[PDB]
């Protein structure tokens, strides 16, 4: 259904298939579905709810910015947009789509 890509650190350029439905990014393989090895990354860093309609923020070690604006907890996220949780810099698109080679961060 959805594929994400990372743009920073050890996993830069890696693309990952997103599981349905509860999806955890983190450095702690006991708690996380997608295991990130950067030291900047919390044991549990980002929790999403995933289904075919879209993806919603559930929880994050730090505020999630979308295009530079904080995202409220249950919000549905915009495919293709710049998404950051601290050092976690990423985007996602629908499975058939092409992922951006670069992200522009809107500080």
UniProtKB/TrEMBL annotation:
Residues 5-94 form the YscD cytoplasmic domain. The chain holds residues 2 to 108 of 419 of the full protein. This is YscD putative type III secretion protein. It comes from Yersinia pseudotuberculosis serotype I (strain IP32953).
């Amino acid at each position: 259904s959805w594929v994400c890509r990372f743009y920073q650190g050890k996993h830069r350029g890696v693309e990952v298939e997103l599981p349905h439905g509860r999806c955890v990014f983190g450095s702690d393989p006991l708690q996380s579905d997608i295991v990130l090895s950067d030291s900047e990354i919390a044991p549990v860093h980002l929790v999403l709810m995933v289904d075919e309609e879209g993806i919603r923020l559930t929880d994050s070690a730090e505020p999630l910015l979308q295009e530079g604006l904080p995202v409220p907890l249950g919000t549905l996220l915009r495919a293709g947009s710049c998404l950051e949780v601290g050092f976690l810099l990423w985007t996602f698109v629908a499975v058939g789509q092409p992922l951006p080679e670069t992200l522009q961060v809107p500080t």
